[PDB]
C-alpha cells in the first residue's frame, strides 16, 4: 500500500501462470475425454483429479487461489461447512469407486451405489450457491457440477454392466439433458450477479473478478456443452484484461451496450498503432507537478477508420489540429518570473502532446509496464503516469519515479489496448455501436485509465495470417465466430463468456440478409478425400421461416452444405451438416479465396439471433452419444 | 462553379448520345439517362482534375445509394467592430443519409465554439450568442453588437424529397476585404434570412428533377489528401476546413425517384427493358470507389480494388403483381477489365435459400467497355414470386493484386424475344 | 479587485468603455427538451453620488449557499434610493446599513 515495491498485474506478488492453476490438470483431462471418451472409466479419473487420495486438499488449494485473485476471503466458519460437505461426497464415492474396480462384481449392487452417489451430490450442491459468498464459491460449485455430470454420462454409456435397465438409461438421458441446462443457468446466475455488483463499485474490480472466472469457471461450462458428443475440441479463447487507473462505476447495461465494444475495437483485426493524449503542468508554483491521460486511440486496420478516440485527441483549442495536411504532435508553453530577492526563476512548464507507439516487428507486443501514482493535496488527488509497451519506453513520469507494474501472462500476447471514458454518461450510442459501418468512439475530457487485453496464444495464427489454416494431423478445429473474414451490417458484439470465447455475433439487420464469412486455407499434405462434418452453434429466440443456411464459396464453385429449420428456442442449439469432402467443394492447396458462409434472411424489428462458434471434425472421429431430443 | 456549369451542359446535350452510340449495335435495350445537375452557389474555388475524381466528387455524392434525411449548416454572424458593416459566414455542411451508418461527416466544421466542448452532457449545443454593450454621455453609442454561432437543421420533408430551393449569396466590398451575406431556403422551409439586408432570390429548380444531395466544397485547404481512403463504405466521408462559403445542390432525374424511395427495383410486366445503374446497389464490398463515368449516361461507376476475400455488388429486385414468371429473360453486364482476372466474373441469383449461377464469363484484359450476355432464364427457375422480399442479383469477382482494378457500369434486363445482336462486335 | 469584464481583447480602444458582456447558449434534445438557455453576464455597475452630495444609508446583503464542497454567493446592492443590484439567484433579506447622525463618505 504505502510501499514502493514492484507490482505484477496490479498485485503485490507474482501471479500463478494460467497453465499452473490448481484446476489445470482437471481441464487438461477434460479436453482429452471430449475427443475420446473411455466408457465406464472416466468418472474414476475425474474423481482422482478433483479428490486426489480421497482428500479435499486440492479443493482447498482452489479456494485459496480464488480468494487471492478477487480480494475476498471466506470466514473460518464457512470453511468448516464446505469441508464437511466434501467428506460426505468422498465417503459415498469411495464406496462406489471401490466396487467397480472389483472384477466380477454384482451389477445390481453398483446400481444402488450409483443412485446414492448422484443424490448425495444433488443434495449438497446448494451449499455452494449462497448469494452472500458466490464470488468465491462459484469456482467450487463448478467442480462439483463437473463431477456429477461426468457420473451421469458414464452411467448412460455402461448401462446393464452397472445393473441398469433400458428404462433406467432412458431416465438418465432425460436427467442429463435437463441438468446440463440447469447447471449452466445457475452458474451464470451467480456470475452476472457478482459481476454487476462489482462493476457498480468499480470497473477494475469487475474485470478482476471476470479474469478469475475465465480461468476457473467458463472453460468448464463450455466443456459441459460438448460432453454429449465425442470428437470435438475443447479450446478457450477468452482474453484477460488489465485495468490501470482510477475508479469508474459501470452498470451491467452499460457494459454490454458500450464499454465492452470499446475495449475490443475491430474484433477480427490486429493492432498496428496506439496513440495517447498526455498532459503535464505545474503552473501554480505551490501545487506540485501533475500529469493527465486524456485519450486513447487504438488503430487496427489502417484502411477502415472504424476506431476513433476514447477520450479526446485535442492538444489545444486556440485553432486547429490539421489544416496544412500535418498533425500537431506537441505543444509546449514556458513562462518566466523574476524578483530581486529570493528570485523565483524556476520556469514553469505546460506540455500537451500525442504519444505514438507502433506495433513491433513481431506484429504483437508480448508484455507491458504501466503504472499510476496518486498524490493527495488538500481536497485534491494528483496523478503521475508511467507507460511502456514491449521494449519501447513511451512515457517516463516527470513527477518522480514510479514503481513498475509488470503486465504479462505466460502463453498470452497483447491484442487490444483501450480505455474507459471518465466523467460522462455511458448511456448513449448503444444501438449505433455495431461491429462495422459505425464510428467506435466516445468523447470525454479525460480517461485517466488504460486497459490492456491479453489474448491466448492459440489465437496468434489467425490475427497474424487473417485466415484459418487446416492441417492433416488434427481431427477437430474450433472457429470462434468473431474470427470472421467479413460480416454484414447492423450486427453487434455480444458477451457470451460461457461459450469459452471472446464473444458472439448478434445479427439484427432488417433488409437484404444477415451473413458472416470465414476464411479457410489448406496446409500442404492435407487429405482432400477425407470426409468431414460441420457443426453450427446458434441461438434462435425468434422464428426464422426461411431458416439458416451453411454454404461453401470457392471462387466460382458455390455449394450448399446444409439448410436447417430455425424454430424458436431460447437455448443454444447445434446444427450438424451432412458429410462432405474438400474435393467436392473444389478446394486445393493453392486455393486462396475459399470461404464458409453462414447466412439467414432479413429480420423483423425487434428480432435477432446469435452465432457462437463452428466445429469442423472428421466424420470418423465424431459421434452423438447422448441424444439431445430426449427431454 | 465554372466546371460544373459546363458539365451540366454536356449531361443534357452530349453524354446521352454517347451512351446511345454504345447501344446501337443491339435492338431491344433501353436508353435512359440518370445524370444529375449541380447548382453551385458561393465563392470561387479552383480544383485540378485529379482533385475532382479523388475527393470532391465523392464529397458531393455522399451515400450514393441512399436518400437524404437531414442536412445541417454551421452559420456565423458578427458586427463587433462598429465601423465595418455586418457579415455572415458559412462554415460547414453536414448531410446525413442513412441515420444508422455514420458514413458522412462535416464538410468544413461544425464547431460552434472553442471554450470547451460540444457534447459532454448528452446534448448538442445549437446556438451560442454573445452581446456586448458600450456607452458614452454625448453621442451615446448604445448600439449593442451581436455575435452569433449556430447550427441550422432542415429535416427532409414529408414527401421524402425537396423539390426545389432558393439559395443566394451577396458580396460587399470594403477596402481590401469582401464581405458575405447568405439566404437559405429548402422546399417551403425558410432556413436562413440574411441579417445584413434583403438578398434577391435565386430559384434552383428543374422540371422533371428533384433534390437528392446537398453538399459543399472545402475552402482554403489542400485537396490532395485522403484520396485512397475515401471509399464507398467503411470510411468517414468528410474533410475539415475553416469555412466552405459555398453550398452545392444536386438534382437527380425523376426516373430515379422510385429507387431512392423504395430501396429496391420493381419490375413490371408491361415493360420490355430495364436499366440498372451500378450505384443503385443494395450493398457493396469494401475497398471500392466512386468513378465518374458520365459517358455511360449514369452518375458513376464502381471501381473495385479489394485484395482479399472477394469483390461483390448486390442489387435488390422485387416483382409487381401481374408479372409473368414464365417469360424468358436475358441479362447484359457492362464492365471494363484493364487487368486479367483468371477466375473471371460471375453473375448469380440469390433468393433466400435458392442460389443459382446465371453466367460465368472469361475476363481477358481490354481497356474498353465490354458487354457480357448471360443465357436465357425464367423467374420461376430462380424461385422468385410476387411475395419474395430478399431476392438479389450478385455480380462478383475474386480478390485482386496490388494496383489492379475493374469497373462495373450498368445492368440490362431484357425479354429474350425483344433482344437481338445486329452488329457483331467481334468483327474488328 | 479588477474591472476586467473580459479577456478576449480590450476594454477601451475606440474611446468608449465596455459596460456589459452577455453570453447565451442553447441546447436541445427531442425527448425531455433541455431548452433552458444558460446565461453568462459580466458588467460594470455605476452609481453616481446623489443630488444631496452624500448617500444617507444603504441596503447591501450577501446570501451563502452550500453545494458539496463549494459555497456559492448571491448579492443585493442598494445605495440611497437607487437599486444597483437585485439578485438573480433569489430573494435576499435586507441588511439596513444606517446610523442616525452619520452619512456615507467612503465605499
Author numbering:
A (entry chain A): 13 to 643
B (entry chain A): 216 to 643
C (entry chain A): 323 to 429
Question: How do the authors describe this structure?
Answer:
Cry11Aa crystallizes as hexagonal plates and Cry11Ba crystallizes as larger bipyramidal crystals. We opted to derivatize our Cry11Aa nanocrystals with a recently-introduced phasing-agent, a caged-terbium compound, Tb-Xo416,17. The phases obtained from single-wavelength anomalous dispersion (SAD) were sufficient to reveal the Cry11Aa protoxin structure at 2.6 Å resolution and subsequently enable phasing of the Cry11Ba protoxin structure at 2.4 Å resolution by molecular replacement. Two Tb-Xo4 molecules were identified bound to the single Cry11Aa molecule in the asymmetric unit (isomorphous peaks at 23 and 9 σ, and anomalous peaks at 33 and 8.1 σ, respectively). Regardless, phases were of sufficient quality to reveal all Cry11Aa residues from N13 to the C-terminal K643. The in vivo crystallization pathway can be best trailed from Cry11Aa crystals, which feature a single monomer per asymmetric unit and build on six packing interfaces burying a cumulated surface area (BSA) of 3515 Å2, corresponding to 13.1 % of the total protein surface area. Perpendicular to this axis, another two-fold symmetry axis relates dimer A-B to dimer C-D creating A-C and B-D interfaces. Crystals grow by packing such tetramers in a brick-wall fashion via face-to-back contacts between domains I (interface #2). Using Tb-Xo4, a caged terbium compound, we could phase the Bti Cry11Aa structure by SAD, from ~77,000 diffraction patterns collected on crystals consisting of ~75,000 unit cells on average – an achievement to compare to the determination of the Ls BinAB structure from >370,000 patterns (native and three derivatives) collected on crystals with ~100,000 unit cell.
